[PDB]
Amino acid sequence: VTLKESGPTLVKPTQTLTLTCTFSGFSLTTTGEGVGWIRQPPGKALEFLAFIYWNDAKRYNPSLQSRLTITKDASKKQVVLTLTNLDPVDTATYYCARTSGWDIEFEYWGQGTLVTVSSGSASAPTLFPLVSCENSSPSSTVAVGCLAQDFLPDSITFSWKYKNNSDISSTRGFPSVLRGGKYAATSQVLLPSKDVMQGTDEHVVCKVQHPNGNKEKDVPLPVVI
Amino acid sequence: EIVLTQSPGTLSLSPGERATLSCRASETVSNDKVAWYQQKPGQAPRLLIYGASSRATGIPDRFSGSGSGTDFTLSISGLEPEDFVVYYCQQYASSPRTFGQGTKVEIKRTVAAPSVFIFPPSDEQLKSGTASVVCLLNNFYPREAKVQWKVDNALQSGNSQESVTEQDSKDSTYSLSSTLTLSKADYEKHKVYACEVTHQGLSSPVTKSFNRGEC
Amino acid sequence: EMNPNVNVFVPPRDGFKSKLICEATNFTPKPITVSWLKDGKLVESGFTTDPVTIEQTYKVISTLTISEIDWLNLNVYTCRVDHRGLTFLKNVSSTCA
Amino acid sequence: VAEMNPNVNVFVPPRDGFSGPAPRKSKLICEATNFTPKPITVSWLKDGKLVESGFTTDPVTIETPQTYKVISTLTISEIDWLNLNVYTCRVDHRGLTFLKNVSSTC
Ligand SMILES: *[C@@H]1O[C@H](CO)[C@@H](O[C@@H]2O[C@H](CO)[C@@H](O)[C@H](O)[C@H]2NC(C)=O)[C@H](O)[C@H]1NC(C)=O
């Protein structure tokens, strides 16, 4: 038993949102079996949208009543979900699950899909250099970062390389935050102080792999020594 | 409308010990139809126990449920590193059903002094009319920390979102980033920008600042 | 970025083997390389470099071992300082000889 | 564990060792090595007059009997050097005083 979701990755506010839950391996003929939708905004808990039983029996949430519609098609074996009056605060990932009886609720879960509701467009990310202004305190090591801004949807992977195309293990990845209708993220890397006062390499390159452009700006080291 | 509240929000446990999760309901649930779910960030939630007393297929026997009415407790014997995820309690006797806030369990560790670094906005970024000042906190414990922005002795408010990373897999520490956003015209009207960091393991607050034009 | 000053000390005219000290002061950044030359020939042994200390400015001192007979023969000793891609050479000799 | 008399050495600038805006200035180096115990007193004398300013003494550092070294630097003026002034380095070690006299005369 497995479930698969599908739908648009970007929808404008105050529009119509449609999602499809693809399942195969069972039929909604026996009693107790049902399909439900659960969403979870980032940093929040699960939210119950609606649940539909057999014999075309559907249940809706009073907090969201008269705003959602549940339709099923046994021919294609997939439930259709329609969402109207889209709001930026309602952005979340939607999941569907199968209930195998009256007591075993949501036994199998799919994978879900991120549906971003932003008035903006999917523009290429913008990188900005970061210069460390630390002074009078070299401390253990020095840090240099890379500010990826104006990206949508939030799907970015960070990799750090030296001037000679080496490999660096940073693993410092900060989650994105919705600020002014756009997602912003920050990434840094830790480098030893000895290497700064050594090789002639005075800068490193910041690389981001986003499906809107393959730009890669370089962040120059401030050098303190 | 059954309101479910879970407390405490965050608890620090150690591997091998016993962890007890509390689930509070706003009213009695018919037939004690309360179930527990396990969710890991990135992946999808998985069912563990249905009906608060019967486990499901592919679930270890170390998870046990107890209680009835409006009080439910989840006991887990033999805590494992992979079990440090968020857990939710949900009842299916409401129709429509409701979900709780959820509780997160973290690995208990010693207090480590954080590292504070501030990067002034680049000249290229200033050309776009937006200035971004960052305040980075790394290698601190516990997750609870206060980050306040003070510029020209004036405390700022209502302009900091605050982003915090998850627990490190190999270091068990936490990291967070604070971003300062202000207009380009307002940026030129201020000289010194500083973010104050307060930590439990620090005797006195440490403040870092920079001078405009020297960086 | 400030060019390092090169100064070479010589043994007293009225007598002292001896040592040659080349000092670079008021230079930035901290890393700096100091070597010695003898009549235009590279020196492979007999010289040591002390750890760089903080006087922000830094200070570096080096010691070269020389013999009295070589000094009296009007041998030329040159201190080579490399800093930010620039090379500075200072030549000294006995005043009374 | 042992007592050894310190060795006093004085370094003087060459004839072309003066630079900078007029009046030019230079430095004098007095170093005591292979002395024990670690405590030692270094003083600078100029024509019999004690020098109370313009000098910096480096901390004693370690160079089998234990050995130590001390480096002292005194700033001097070109005009004073041209007047055949004699500079004497005063070293005190376990109550013993050692004096070294240097001059520009050949
Ligand atoms: C690229 O240049 C860097 C210099 O910053 C090299 O790093 C040095 O080489 C060793 C061996 O790879 C590294 O482990 C050290 O970080 C550096 N050495 C010292 C003494 O600190 C790096 O190796 C170069 N890349 C490649 C592929 O050779």
For D98, the 3-state DSSP assignment is strand
Residue with structure tokens 């999808």?
B44
Tokens (6 digits) for B98:
């409701």
Residues B102 and B118 in one domain: no
CA distance A225 to chain C (A): 7
Q: Rounded distance, CA A202 to CA B211, Å?
A: 23
Give me ligand 1 centre to Cα A124, in Å.
33
* CB spacing of D11 vs C14 below 8 angstroms: no
- With CA atoms as reference, the chain C residue closest to A198 would be C31
Q: Is C46 on the interface with A (CB under 8 A)?
A: no
Read off the DSSP letter of residue B39. E
Residue B195 bridge partners (DSSP): B149, B208
Q: Which residues of D touch C18 (CB under 8 A)?
A: 9
CA distance B91 to chain A (A): 9
Asked if C32 and C10 touch (Cβ cutoff 8 Å), the reply is: no
Last residue of a domain, one of B80, B109, B138: B109
Q: What backbone torsions phi and psi does residue D10 show, to the nearest 5 degrees?
A: -125, 130
- With CA atoms as reference, the chain A residue closest to B86 would be A45
Chains contacting A (3 or more CB pairs within 8 Å):
B, C
* CB spacing of A128 vs B132 below 8 angstroms: yes
**Residues listed for chain A:** 225
User: Atom 11, ligand 1: which residue's CA is nearest?
Assistant: A166
In CATH, A120-220 is 2.60.40.10 = yes
Chain B residues 78-107 within an 8 A CB cutoff of chain A: 88, 90, 92, 95-102
Q: Rounded distance, CA D44 to CA D55, Å?
A: 8
3-state secondary structure chain A: CEEEEECCCEECCCCEEEEEEEEECCCCCCCCCEEEEEEECCCCCCEEEEEECCCCCEEECHHHCCCEEEEEECCCCEEEEEEECCCHHHCEEEEEEEECCCCCCCCEECCCEEEEECCCCCCCCEEEECCCCCCCCCCCCEEEEEEEEEECCCCCCEEEECCCCCCCCCCCECCCEEECCEEEEEEEEEECHHHHCCCCCCEEEEEECEECECCCCEEECCCCC
Residues B147 and B69 in one domain: no
Q: Which of A191, A195, A197 to mutate to test the pocket of ligand 1 (most atoms within 8 A of CB)?
A: A195
Q: Which of A164, A189, A197 to mutate to test the pocket of ligand 1 (most atoms within 8 A of CB)?
A: A164
Quote the longest CA-to-CA distance of chain D.
51
Evaluated on CA atoms B102, B108, B113, B117, the torsion sign reads negative
User: Atom 20, ligand 1: which residue's CA is nearest?
Assistant: A195
Please give the CATH architecture assigned to the domain spanning A1-119: Sandwich (2.60)
Chain B residues 38-67 within an 8 A CB cutoff of chain A: 39, 44-47, 50-51, 54, 56
User: Atom 2, ligand 1: which residue's CA is nearest?
Assistant: A164
Evaluated on CA atoms B139, B143, B146, B148, the torsion sign reads positive
How far CA B165 is from CA of B139, B140, B148, B174, in Å, comes to: 11, 12, 18, 6
Q: Rounded distance, CA A127 to CA A206, Å?
A: 8
Q: Dihedral, CA atoms, B61, B66, B72, B78, nearest 10 degrees?
A: -40
CA nearest neighbour of A160 among A116, A97, A79, A218:
A218
3-state secondary structure chain C: CCCCCCEECECCCCCCCEEEEEEEEEECCCCCEEEEEECCEECCCCEEECCCEECCCEEEEEEEEECHHHHHCCCCEEEEEEECCEEEEEEECCCCC
Domain residue limits, chain A? 1-119, 120-220
Q: Rounded distance, CA B40 to CA B84, Å?
A: 9
Give me ligand 1 centre to Cα A164, in Å.
9
Residues B148 and B184 in one domain: yes
Asked if B53 and B35 touch (Cβ cutoff 8 Å), the reply is: no
For B123, the 3-state DSSP assignment is helix
Residue D90 bridge partners (DSSP): D43, D99
Q: Is the minimum distance from the CB of A164 to ligand 1 under 6 angstroms?
A: yes
Structural domain range at position B65: 1-109
Q: Rounded distance, CA B66 to CA B22, Å?
A: 11
CATH number at residue B128: 2.60.40.10
In CATH, C1-97 is 2.60.40.10 = yes
Residues B94 and B123 in one domain: no
Residues B121 and B70 in one domain: no
Q: What backbone torsions phi and psi does residue B40 show, to the nearest 5 degrees?
A: -110, 135
Tokens (6 digits) for D86:
């004699």
Residues B81 and B121 in one domain: no
Residues B24 and B103 in one domain: yes
Report the 10 Å Cβ neighbour count for A150: 18
D3-106, superfamily in CATH?
Immunoglobulins (2.60.40.10)
Residues B117 and B80 in one domain: no
Residue D62 bridge partners (DSSP): D68
Q: What backbone torsions phi and psi does residue D8 show, to the nearest 5 degrees?
A: -110, 125
Q: Is A57 on the interface with B (CB under 8 A)?
A: no
Give me ligand 1 centre to Cα A167, in Å.
10
For D82, the 3-state DSSP assignment is helix
User: Atom 7, ligand 1: which residue's CA is nearest?
Assistant: A195
- Nearest-atom number in ligand 1 for the CA of A162 is 1
- With CA atoms as reference, the chain A residue closest to B133 would be A130
Q: Is A175 on the interface with B (CB under 8 A)?
A: yes
CA distance C28 to chain A (A): 9
Size of interface C-D (CB pairs under 8 A): 55
Domain residue limits, chain D? 3-106
Q: Rounded distance, CA B107 to CA B15, Å?
A: 8
- With CA atoms as reference, the chain A residue closest to B170 would be A171
Q: Tell me whether the CATH fold assigned to A1-119 matches the one assigned to A120-220.
A: yes
Tokens (6 digits) for A220:
């120059």
Evaluated on CA atoms B59, B61, B64, B65, the torsion sign reads positive
Q: Rounded distance, CA A103 to CA A214, Å?
A: 50
Q: Rounded distance, CA B28 to CA D14, Å?
A: 99
Domain count, chain B: 2
Residues B2 and B95 in one domain: yes
User: Atom 3, ligand 1: which residue's CA is nearest?
Assistant: A199
Scored b (16 or more CB within 10 A) or e, C65-87 reads: ebeeeebeeeeebbbbbebeeee
| Cis peptide bond prior to B96, omega within 30° of 0 | yes
Q: Where are the alpha helices (DSSP H) in chain B?
A: 123-127, 184-188
For D53, the 3-state DSSP assignment is coil
Amino acid at position A106, single letter? F
Q: Is the minimum distance from the CB of A73 to ligand 1 under 6 angstroms?
A: no
Task: For chains A and C, tell me whether 3 or more CB atom pairs sit within 8 A of each other.
Answer: yes
Residue B60 bridge partners (DSSP): none
- Substitution target in A188, A203, A217 with the highest count of B β-carbons within 10 Å is A188
- Of the candidates D17, D104, D105, the beta carbon closest to that of C7 is on D17
